[PDB]
């Protein structure tokens, strides 16, 4: 009975990934819903008294790579509560009955450590609409999930069941009834893309301006957040390729701060960068040409049919996440 | 053994018969089946036998577990709210011993009532499933549901199921009373809004509740509850939109108003202490915004499958 | 460990069915290719040192009943090496993730 809690104690993370609300570019409706879900019942407990109850479940859905796990990291950072990060490897067991006793002990620990947050990434693996799947695991896990979510003699009060999935239409109808907040996280718009570029570039010394970031956001038409992250990564790795595949360096302005340039200048010394020791390194600064080359190299991942499926799911049972 | 100390609840959740909006036939059937053998014990003897099996079904989120909570509140009897988690073990034979001792304790604690939520977790139709944990448990439940001569006085089995066509036909025939819980009508919608608002101050009238129930076309009970929750949370969002606060009348009860007024004290909202914030009142516009936000959680395929099931086994 | 080896020990044949190379008519190029690829690394291993490597797989296709399994019987006869005769019933299993381990 204690080995179950010892196995489930590895699902409570204590690393606290530093993702703040200013790190998330856009998604103001989802951020406001998560704020009124977690920040308010701990900061202002004198408002949720009587017939006013907080939210008891939020389903984040959308295209792959839009920021659902990033909002989960931001909630785990700024929640100041117990965060349960479970998956299909922490609930399914080899024996018989342990696959439901683990879920019962997980919800018992979540109710014992209230206020607590249960984050189940990829809820479509556990809830497979119980029509054709494996009888034992599917039926028992889904029914125990329903009973531990509301049930009769459980009274789940103060816990939050976060869920992030890419396939929202393959959920069970009872699970979709349990998740009382269907929040659609879409692909980012122009202002969100420009703020995401401003966040991902950071304190790197570059000649880019706000008009340059605006033209970059206008260029990335249909990109996702991971695609913006990898074109920022490619544009940041571009000065390393510039300092690798070039010769005829030149000391600019400091203990020989030498920089690659055109062959033939005021001191175009023909040597290699491997002989250059550290801290006499003046790499070329970022321009718009490196980000244009990163845009030309890296291609968008999300197609234009899954967007139609997510749009049909929003018009069927979904809200908007701005 | 002693592991069944969590199947019975001692909380008694305060859900009375007036809280259950609508469902008059199911309410009166559960009422007679839980009251009349305790009210008039001479009425049930021999031929005129009471109901020993009650099954509830319909769309998901219509009031099955709510009716079970109402029975557990206004029954005055031992409630056995147990599911498939406390019936299956790692060993062999203990999965039958659990059901045997469960029915033994339920017969020893007469008058009792056993409520099995999601009974399809025990009825996998034994196609190619787990033998020792499916078929033997199903036959044990079939021979322990043979209390038409054994448990004439005492226990009563219940059932709540969202998907009732995937159910074993033997236990379906053993459940003699199968009541279909439908989507609520307009009067049930209006009294459900009246119950869910409750003692919260508002300006909503009976005509406002009637047009709210007319706007909710095809909504369910949980959808009505989360619409009421969103309408309750909307004045907190209006306070969070803090601009040009204004004091009303005791001991500095502030209230935000339109930008540009008489006495528009432009300040924040977190600088003020508690118990002096006169919150705005519930209009109909926040309710209409919650209606436009919240979507119905049920589809048309489940409704036609429920219609097929009730026309096949009404 | 022991179950997989006990199931796969029956695939090795030790009966050595006596079909010589003269018992097959025609097929000169296939006979030469199979003859070198089974005989020469066993007989003269000093000819394949470094840059030169023997053949690592031969497909014998054609119409049904042309002597493909008879040619395989000839290779199994005059191979003087271990012969594994597997089929669909020895590799495919009922459990999940058991055929790949086999």
């Amino acid at each position: 009975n204690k080995k179950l809690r010892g196995a489930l104690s590895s699902a409570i993370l204590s690393e606290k990934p530093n993702v703040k609300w200013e790190d998330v570019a856009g998604l103001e409706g989802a951020k406001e819903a998560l704020k009124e879900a977690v920040i308010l019942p701990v900061k202002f407990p004198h408002l949720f008294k009587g017939n006013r109850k907080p939210t008891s479940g939020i389903l984040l859905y959308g295209p792959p790579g839009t920021g659902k796990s990033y909002l989960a990291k931001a909630v785990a950072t700024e929640a100041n509560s117990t965060f349960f990060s479970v998956s299909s490897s922490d609930l399914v067991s080899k024996w018989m009955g342990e696959s439901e006793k683990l879920v019962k002990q997980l919800f018992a620990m979540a109710r014992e450590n209230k206020p607590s947050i249960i984050f189940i990434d990829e809820v479509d693996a556990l809830t497979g609409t119980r029509g054709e799947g494996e009888s034992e695991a599917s039926r028992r896990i889904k029914t125990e999930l329903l009973v531990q979510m509301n049930g009769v003699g459980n009274d789940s009060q103060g816990v939050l069941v976060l869920g992030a999935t890419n396939i929202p239409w393959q959920l069970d109808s009872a699970i979709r009834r349990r998740f009382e907040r269907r929040i659609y996280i879409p692909l980012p718009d122009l202002a969100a893309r420009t703020t995401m570029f401003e966040i991902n570039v950071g304190d790197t010394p570059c000649v880019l301006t706000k008009e340059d970031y605006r033209t970059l956001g206008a260029m990335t038409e249909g990109y996702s957040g991971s695609d913006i992250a990898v074109v920022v990564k490619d544009a940041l790795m571009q000065p390393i390729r510039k300092i690798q595949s070039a010769t005829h360096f030149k000391d600019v302005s400091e203990t020989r701060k030498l920089t690659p340039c055109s062959p033939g200048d005021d001191g175009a010394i023909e040597m290699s960068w491997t002989d250059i020791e550290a801290d006499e390194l003046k790499e070329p600064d970022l321009t718009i040409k490196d980000f244009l080359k990163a845009i030309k190299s890296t291609r968008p991942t999300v197609n234009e049919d899954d967007l139609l499926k997510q749009e049909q799911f929003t018009r069927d049972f979904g809200q908007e996440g701005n | 053994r002693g592991a069944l100390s969590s199947a019975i609840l001692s909380e008694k959740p305060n859900v009375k018969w007036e809280d259950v909006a609508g469902l008059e036939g199911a309410k009166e059937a559960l009422k007679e089946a839980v009251i009349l053998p305790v009210k008039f014990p001479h009425l049930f003897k021999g031929n005129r036998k009471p109901t020993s099996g009650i099954l509830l079904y319909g769309p998901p989120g219509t009031g099955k577990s709510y009716l079970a909570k109402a029975v557990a509140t206004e029954a005055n009897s031992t409630f056995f709210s147990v599911s498939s988690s406390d019936l299956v073990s790692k060993w062999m034979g203990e999965s039958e011993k659990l059901v045997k001792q469960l029915f033994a304790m339920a017969r020893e604690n007469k008058p009792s009532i056993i409520f099995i939520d999601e009974v399809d977790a025990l009825t996998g139709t034994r196609g190619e499933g787990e033998s020792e944990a499916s078929r033997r448990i199903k036959t044990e439940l079939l021979v322990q549901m043979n209390g038409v001569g054994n448990d004439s006085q005492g226990v009563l089995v219940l059932g709540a199921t969202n998907i009732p066509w995937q159910l074993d036909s033997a236990i379906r025939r053993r459940f003699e009373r199968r009541i279909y819980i439908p989507l609520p009508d307009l009067a049930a919608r209006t009294t459900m809004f009246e119950i869910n608002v409750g003692d919260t101050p508002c300006v909503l009238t009976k005509e406002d509740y009637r047009t709210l129930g007319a706007m909710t076309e095809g909504y369910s009970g949980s959808d009505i509850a989360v619409v009421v929750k969103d309408a309750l949370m909307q004045p907190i969002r209006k306070i969070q939109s803090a601009t040009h606060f204004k004091d009303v009348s005791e001991t500095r009860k502030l209230t935000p108003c339109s930008p540009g007024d008489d006495g528009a004290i432009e300040m924040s909202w977190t600088d003020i202490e508690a118990d002096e914030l006169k919150e705005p009142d519930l209009t109909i516009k926040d309710f209409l915004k919650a209606i436009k936000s919240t979507r119905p959680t049920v589809n048309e395929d489940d409704l036609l499958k429920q219609e097929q099931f009730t026309r096949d086994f009404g | 460990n022991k179950k997989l080896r006990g199931a796969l020990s029956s695939a090795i044949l030790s009966e050595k069915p006596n079909v010589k190379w003269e018992d097959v008519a025609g097929l000169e190029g296939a006979k030469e290719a199979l003859k070198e690829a089974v005989i020469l690394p066993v007989k003269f291993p000093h000819l394949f040192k470094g840059n030169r490597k023997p053949t690592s797989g031969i497909l014998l296709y054609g119409p049904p009943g042309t002597g493909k399994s008879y040619l395989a019987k000839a290779v199994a006869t005059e191979a003087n090496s271990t012969f594994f005769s597997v089929s669909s019933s020895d590799l495919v299993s009922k459990w999940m993730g058991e055929s790949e381990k086999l």
Binding site: W95 | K90, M92, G129, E132 | W95
Partner: peptide, 20 residues
């Protein structure tokens, strides 16, 4: 008896509980 271990089979899934 002893413990009962759940296994997995393939169709064309189920739970063939081969105990010890």
């Amino acid at each position: 008896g002893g413990d009962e271990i759940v296994n997995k089979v393939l169709g064309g899934x189920x739970x063939x509980x081969x105990x010890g």
